Every structure is written in structure tokens, then in C-alpha cells.
Ligand binder design. Sequence first.
Ligand code: PLX
Ligand code: PEE
Lengths: 57, 459
Amino acid sequence: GWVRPDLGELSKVTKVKTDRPLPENPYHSRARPEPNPEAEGDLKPAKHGSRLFFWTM
Amino acid sequence: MLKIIIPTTMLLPMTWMSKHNMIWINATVHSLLISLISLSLLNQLGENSLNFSLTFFSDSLSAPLLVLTTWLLPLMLMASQSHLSKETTTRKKLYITMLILLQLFLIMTFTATELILFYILFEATLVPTLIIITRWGNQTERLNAGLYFLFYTLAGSLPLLVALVYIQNTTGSLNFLIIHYWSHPLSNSWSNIFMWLACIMAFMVKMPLYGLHLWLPKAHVEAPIAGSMVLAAVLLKLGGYGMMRITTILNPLTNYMAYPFLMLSMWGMIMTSSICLRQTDLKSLIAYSSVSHMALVIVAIMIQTPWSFMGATALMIAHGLTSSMLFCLANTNYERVHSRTMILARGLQTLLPLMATWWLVASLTNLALPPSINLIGELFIITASFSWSNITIILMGMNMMITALYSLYMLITTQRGKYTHHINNIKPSFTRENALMALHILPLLLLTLNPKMILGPLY
Ligand SMILES: CCCCCCCCCCCCCCCCC[C@@H](O)O[C@H](CO[C@H](O)CCCCCCCCCCCCCCC)COP(=O)(O)OCC[N+](C)(C)C
Ligand SMILES: CCCCCCCC/C=C\CCCCCCCC(=O)O[C@H](COC(=O)CCCCCCC/C=C/CCCCCCCC)COP(=O)(O)OCCN
């Protein structure tokens, strides 16, 4: 009672039901380094301007 | 302070929009009015300076220099219009523009609160002077003179700039008030020695110090009359003023870093006074006399005492007036005879009596006759030097002798004796020339009545 698979059937992506637990860290990755914290707050004008040599603005 | 700066800036469109025959009148009248307005800066406080704003401030050291600059502009205009008559309208306006720009740069230089702004204006004064010398000088040497005037200055000032920015990286500021209040001693190290040299040598070149002075005879001789007047009367003092500002951060290093400069100043003062005794060119003699007086000013600033600072201020003002007058006196005879050889035109007292009187008064102030402010400054410096070391009198007194010896020598060579027979084109003195001499000499004499007004902050 064996039916030969039709053209296009053996190349299907199928689903598999397994009792094997899904691996957590398959790449064996280290802990990722913490990022630089953030930019936060409101933008205030520069204190006493550019503060270049003699420029008051 | 803008009440001085803005009218000076307005002088430019005024001369560029004036009628072809009205440029001199307008420029002279309005420069005189600007000088009258600037005369109000002489009201000084004592304790601290007049701080107009964050950018500009006035001191008892700055105010006489500012008044001298604003007063020198109309005299330069009066002295320039004779030999510039044949010039076109546009080139006359360009000459007046150079003079106005020079005054503007000097006025901003003497009042800048911050050392980089002072440095930028201090260098900016170079360009108009160079253009004046190399475009309106009479002889072929002027070009070479210009080069000497330029690279002597820059070779001194480029290190200073570096030092200045270095200072702002460590101190955090270059504002002169902050620099003075937060001043700290300099340790005894090679780095400190070279920073001291970078801070001092530009002003040394500007004085000029003996041995770095070769640009001055060339530049002052080859320049037109207004160029010589501004170079001797105001520009040299840019060195002195600068030193008086920058020595506040150089203690206690100056206690021993000043020995070579003191030796150079005293010996070269003797040397330049002696050079004046054997000089065939009349303008060269005046230039070397300026070198000797500035050497005395260098000694005063280097010994760092209140009496020496007061004497240096007084001598700077007095020498500015006297040297400008002497240059104008020599230029009158040059325009008569078209030669600067001192022995060509002799016995001029017979032909020009009032100009001979002007010559005599200028020679008297040159040799520091009491109670002129020339001698006030000289005597204060000599007393401070005597306190520094009693042997200095030996050199100082010697200088005095030689000074008189060459001053009267000039007077005797050009005014006395018999007139040269073949020179028959000596016309009577013009009212313009007599008025220029009077406008030089009368303020100098009036300053005797109120000497403190030129004695500086240490008074
Ligand atoms: C034409 C006119 C131009 C202007 C002239 C400007 C003059 C500038 C001269 C500077 C004066 C002094 C500079 C430095 C101070 C002392 C210099 C040295 O000779 O003193 C001895 C220094 O010891 C040795 O002599 C080292 C210096 C010798 C090497 C330098 C070469 C000098 C040869 C002359 C070169 C010409 C210079 C001018 C070129 C135009 C002191 O010994 P010591 O107390 O233990 O060390 C002090 C320094 N510490 C504290 C940092 C350690
Ligand atoms: C008309 C002719 C005038 C010629 C003037 C030439 C002399 C000018 C003075 C020296 C110029 C450069 C000096 C740099 C400015 C000083 C600022 C400073 O403090 O830097 C020093 C560094 O000093 C130097 O490196 C300068 C060394 C010299 C470099 C160039 C040599 C040129 C010839 C040297 C002798 C000539 C200078 C004097 C000449 C006198 C006038 C003839 C210390 O900084 P740090 O690196 O952080 O060190 C801190 C720990 N100690």
C-alpha cells in the first residue's frame, strides 16, 4: 500500500512534535555587555555661550 | 568704550563719501573730536579699572595711551597732506583708510580684557603699517624695510600665541582680571623657562631690545612721515604695555630670567646713544634715540617696582610725543631739500627762525630737561634702578651725558653755522608745519602741570 509521493511533496516544510526541550543558549553566548546608559533631560542653552576665547556668545 | 570705537569706524564711510577736496578737512576735524571724547577716559579710580563690559576695560595705564593714539591721528593727517597732494583721490582715501584702520586696531588693542583678543589686534596692527611703508615709502629700500618689519615681529609673536593657548588650557581663562586674581608662582623648571621666554620675547622684539632692533632703523627711515610718527609714538609702546600686563604671571621667575635682558638694555642703551654721535642720516639718529629710550623702559619693566612702572609709563608717553615731533621737524627739511643727509642743509636758524625755536624745544625735551615729563620718567626709572643696584648709576649717568651730546649735536648741525650757499629753495615755514609743531609741543608741556595723569596704575 505504498503510494509514491507526487512532485512537490518531499520538498515541503513540515512540522515535528518532539519531547526534546528547546535549547536555551545553543550558541553558548556570553552575557552581552551593558550599553551606554542613555541621553535624557531637556535641552538648555549653553552656559555663557560657546565660551570660546573672547566671544561672549 | 564703544563711544570711542564707533565714531572711529564711522570715519571710514565719511572719508569714502567725501568730496575730492574735503577729505583732509573732514578727517582732521572728526579725528580731533574723537580725541576730545577719548579725553574723558582719564578719570580713573585707583582701586580697580573701569570695566565697561566683558570685552573692554580701561586702566590708568591704558587711558594715556588711548588719548595719545587719538591725538596722533589728526597730527598724522596734517603731516601727510603735503607730500600726498599729487596723489589721486582714491589713493588718498586709501591712505586715510590705512591710518583709520591702524587707529581702530590700536584703540581696541589697548582696551581688550582678554589676552587672545589683545594678541589678535596686536598682530592686526601690522598689516596697515606694512601697506603704508611699502606703498607710500619713497626709496627702493622700503620693500626690504617692510620685510624686516614683518618677520622680526612674527618670529617673536608666533611663540607667544602658543604660550597663550597653552595657558588657557591649564588656567582655564585668559581674562586679565581672572589672571591677576588667580595668579600663581612659576616654579624653577625648563618648561617654565621656555614659557617665560615665549611670553616675553614678542614684546622684547617690539620695544625693540638691543640686539633685536635692526628692523627699527630700516622701517622708521624708509617709512613716510605718518608711518614714522605712528611707529615711534604708539607702536613701540605696544611692547611696553604688553610686558606690564604679562609679568603678573611670570613671578618669581623674572627674578633671574631678567638678567640677560637687563644687561642687554643697559649696555645697548650706551651703544645706541654712542651710535647717534656718528650718524650721517637725520632720521636714523632719531630712530636710534628711540632705541635708547626704549632700552631704559625695558630696564624699568624688568625690575618690577612701583617706581619703575610709574617711570616707564611717563617715559613712554613723553617719548611718543618727543619722537613724533622730531620726525616731523626732520621731514620739513627733507621736503625742503629732498635729502636726509644732516650736513647738507646747515645754518637754518638764519633762514627759518621759528622752526629753529621748535627744533630747540624738541631737543630740550629729548635730553630730558626738568621739569619735563621725559625727565620725570627717566629719574623715576633711575632711582628704582639705583635701589636695584647702586652701580647702575654709572651706566645711567653715562647714558644721560651721551644723550645730551647727540641731541645738541643735531641741533648744532642743522640750525647753526652758516647756510649752505647753493641751496636757494628754502621757502618760509607754512602755517601747517608751525601748527603741527605746536600741537606736538604744547600738550607735552601741559602734562607737567598734572603728571599723575600719565603716571599709571601704581600712582
Ligand atoms: C640678540 C639678542 C637676542 C635676545 C637674547 C635673549 C636671552 C635669553 C637667555 C636666557 C637666560 C637664562 C636661560 C635659563 C636660565 C639658566 C641657564 C643655565 O645656563 O643655567 C644653569 C643651567 O645648567 C646648565 O648650564 C644647563 C644649560 C646649558 C645648555 C644650554 C645651552 C647654552 C649655550 C648658549 C646658547 C645661546 C642662546 C641664545 C641663542 C640666540 C643653571 O644650573 P642649574 O641651577 O643646575 O639648572 C637650572 C634649571 N633647572 C632648575 C630647571 C634644573
Ligand atoms: C625676534 C626673534 C625672537 C625669537 C623668539 C624665540 C623664543 C620663544 C620662546 C620659546 C618658543 C616655544 C616655547 C613654547 C611655549 C611654552 C609653553 C609651555 O609651557 O610648554 C612647555 C614645553 O616647552 C617646550 O617644549 C619648548 C622647547 C623648545 C622647542 C622649540 C625650540 C626652539 C629653540 C629653543 C631656544 C629659542 C627660544 C628662546 C629664543 C630667545 C629669542 C632669540 C611645557 O609644556 P609641557 O609639555 O606640558 O611640559 C610640562 C612638564 N614640564
